[PDB]
């Protein structure tokens with residue numbers, strides 16, 4: 649109420665339930681990649697210093713042929729994202745804009761990202777992945793959740809509260 | 821492990837506790853604006869159609885002489901943001917980049933925002949605000965949480981489960 653951001657998010661409320669976000673990357677490929685590199689990404693989240701590249705995302709862009717030679721193929725990736733919403737026009741504008749927004753966001757921190765790409769293993773068998781893939785993929789999901797079209801949002805007291813929280817609390 | 825997102829976010833954990841996100845606008849102003857316009861923004865979030873402008877934000881930008889005539893003053897506002905973290909060097913690059921990203925997002929969504937500024941009251945005392953201020957202030961707080969620097973993140977089990985959620989779940 650008064651301080652609504654105090655309580656925090658609604659409990660049994662999964663944002664993927666509330667907002668049926670289209671699959672920009674094949675879901676089977678993404679879960680495969682998660683099963684393989686999920687534990688490493690979880691560890692790296694707790695490491696200090698330059699953020700380390702997400703190997704889940706880099707796995708996903710390898711498998712879809714969008715990452716190669718330290719380079720993520722912007723035009724090819726953008727087109728894959730549009731193809732994923734070819735049956736969802738309510739998302740087409742949004743997916744287009746998020747794409748450019750996310751690529752431009754990466755460009756602003758490109759120095760940090762490239763630094764991240766150049767790290768050496770901190771330990772035994774550390775896979776050093778280029779952070780570009782995970783920057784784009786996390787950016788997209790966030791851009792999309794945060795701007796979920798009203799026409800697709802799932803309406804219920806907890807999804808409505810999750811929406812109220814995420815829309816108001818970040819600014820106050 | 822197996823289903824890292826179905827479970828959803830940690831139960832009683834408030835992002836602001838795990839992440840000491842700096843206040844870019846004076847909290848008094850934000851709270852006064854929220855008390856005036858909270859309820860109306862809550863109803864607007866449930867309305868279909870073009871997204872309606874957030875009056876909480878517009879109120880705050882009025883209070884600080886940042887909004888006038890369908891336009892936020894980009895230079896003055898950016899300056900105000902940077903000034904707000906002058907003693908938080910671990911947020912400077914982040915806030916400045918977020919500032920540019922967020923204005924440039926607004927630019928991409930310009931027709932929608934302008935259309936939202938012209939909407940008609942759907943209920944009796946509904947105030948129609950320009951969406952530009954809400955666009956910027958939500959964008960900023962969302963960019964800032966989503967990239968909370970490792971060096972300032974409060975570490976415990978729940979804040980780590982939260983960060984794992986926030987970084988992995990939006991991409992799968």
Ligand code: NA
Pocket residue numbers: 692693694695696697698699700970
């Ligand atoms: Na780190």
Ligand code: NA
Pocket residue numbers: 744745748928
């Ligand atoms: Na665009």
Ligand code: NA
Pocket residue numbers: 748749750752753920921924925
């Ligand atoms: Na941009």
Ligand code: NA
Pocket residue numbers: 767768769770771774
């Ligand atoms: Na390393």
Ligand code: NA
Pocket residue numbers: 890891892952
């Ligand atoms: Na404007």
Ligand code: NA
Pocket residue numbers: 920921924
């Ligand atoms: Na720019």
Ligand code: NA
Pocket residue numbers: 937938939940941948
């Ligand atoms: Na009007």
